[model samples]
Target: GTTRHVYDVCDCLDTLAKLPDDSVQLIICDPPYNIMLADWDDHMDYIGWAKRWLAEAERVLSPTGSIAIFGGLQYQGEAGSGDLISIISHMRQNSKMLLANLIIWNYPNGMSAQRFFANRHEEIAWFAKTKKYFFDLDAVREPYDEETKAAYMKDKRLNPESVEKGRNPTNVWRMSRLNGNSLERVGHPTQKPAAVIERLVRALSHPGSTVLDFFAGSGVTARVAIQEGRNSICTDAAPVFKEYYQKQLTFLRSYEIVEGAANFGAALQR
Candidate 1:
């Protein structure tokens, strides 16, 4: 009953090329930064795989749809953040995409090392094909004044339009890390919080729009997408990912998964 196709992320770009142009309503690309998780070495180029996918990504997206690229501490520490900055920069200029937002997901806890302080945040770059893009500020607006909202009046001017004087959320965000025994934990090594994805989905997409996550570590984005009335398409090659995501979906008491019957039976086979 599901129309979504699952495949190796590496193979998706070419697959995307085969689709009609301007098809995807939204793209949430959380590609690996090529840090060589298990045995990857520095000599290996992370951008090589990205190059293969980005072109097709550009082609598949609708003119008004937006793409968000998530990068992290690993990429920053290893290849340097400029590496990602340059990549997004090239896409913006050469491909004629709009540099929409550079969002940061910051946390307070991380692995401790003798060399330096722990790194505890990730960066995301959002791009649009042109000046025309979908960004619903009303959906993403945080509480302006709790008292004002509780007792909003016709003439209330509690919320300011420009930057809120000094209380703006800014590009940097403060989110909590998932530690062991946390209620929000789902056991994925690099699983992102649902709140983070909720903001992205609510702010940038409309209901029924396709939200993508090429690396769906635990389907957090998909979960949040469903919560926000958006349709999500997520893919990851690892079988463990399927397990982690399904468990979370089950815990949430939601039966929204596509091909739910096929998904359960295929899990052990994977």
Candidate 2:
């Protein structure tokens, strides 16, 4: 597996600016939903703030590249707060990227709500840079249970080889959320599950290609990319991301971590 990575504690735009055009294959983004209270979280115009990085992201993506953005539609925001809907609206009018799928990430457990429906779902907007975008559905396909597989094998109408390959996970995913005591927790408040990120990395990118995650959050993207044989650049403004990443490294089989963009280019090229 070709697994090399570059990780940095820096501003997203600064990190993105150093990369060359069409250099990245996939981007796994989980930006703050205007609800985070960090120093980097305060923005007067969320869309305006997001557009800067969005343009840079597009420029850094190859024609076959795609981006999966994680956010929710339920964020009722102030003047500066933003949600998935706002970002999608901006992309429609200002960007050329195609909205390939709006994935519903459903968790079985969550806090109860009396004023509104209990929030159990978040949205992942998958945008392809162009029509030539790459997708390997087989990589992330869901295998059927023994009973289902046996039943399908008996159905002559279905291709046995295809049936054995498993079924498409589809746009809507049903994965459990990480609890406080979950072993995978890395101290990042908004850390995503490895299962969720792994599926995205496998299907949206190829081995030996590059994945970029500007909002590195818990550095789960880097972990997934490394294990999946993809080069990656993971950047975040917070210094704590490094510590979170160190915890993630313990789960990897093998990887090479570089310091800067210069080293990243060299490692991947070799």
Candidate 3:
């Protein structure tokens, strides 16, 4: 099986419009919090801007598709109502999508706070485009150690096949937060860890399906998609998007490196 990917420095809405309805199987959305992290991250009308792309995201998803959006406490203060929490609220009130799961991505790194409890976690809001959305839990399952497997198998109540297949990586994922000096660092300030992205990519989407990420910071989606045997269309409105993508490629020391196309037309055709 083969896969294709295309990345570019293009507006989110522009790249989204280039694809037809029901053409994509998964989208990994990491919308900016608009907390002035940078010029691109600053948006005066956040949700109004979000709603435009949100609707476009839905239209392009296949019936059995889904999206996992990354967001969290970044919505406080001047952000007003701009965050994952608000996105869920809006989805519940207006959108036709189903809220499949709210994944608590727990990490073991952060600041020690005297003012309040410092956060060591973030949220991944997974939404299914339809009731029939695809999910393959086994693809991202956690392997049980020999001792644990033996103990479970000895119990008559446990299904043997289930024990052999490993356990579900529950909603609360305990992963390491990438530090500044980590080898995976590609210089995108808020680049997501590949482990988290891998789980979402493997479970929510099947091999050969298109995984679209318009907010392709660090271009991690394209990297993960290709490594997992899926086609991809990744883009970002930031000028340095291509630079970050190239850096991501340099770290692909143990994977297949395929040639990508120019734009959405060729991307979709593949």
Q: Give the top-scoring candidate (lDDT).
A: 2
Estimate, for each residue in 28-119, the C-alpha lDDT of model 3 and write its tens digit. 99987653335334555567568878999999999999999998956665642478887887789889999999999999989899998898
| Model 2 lDDT, full chain set | 0.87
Off by over 4 Å in 3: 35-44, 77-81, 253-262
lDDT for position 229 in model 1 = 59
Candidate 2 structure quality by residue, lDDT tens digits, 207-241: 88998998998899988888788888888989998
Query: Which is the better candidate, 1 or 3, if ranked by TM-score?
Result: 3
Ranked by TM-score, top first: 2, 3, 1
Error of 3 at 249 (Å): 1.7
Worst 10 residues of 2 by lDDT: 35-44
Model 3: residue 174 alpha-carbon error in angstroms: 0.6
- RMSD score of candidate 3 (Å): 3.1
lDDT of 1 by residue, 1-270 (tens): 222322223235434544467766677777666534532433344554465577777776778888888875443445412356646756755677777888888887777888976777788888887688888776665655756544543435654443233244567888886767766667787777777777778777777666766677777776676566555656665667677666666655222455332232221110
lDDT for model 1, please: 0.63
lDDT of each: 0.63, 0.87, 0.83
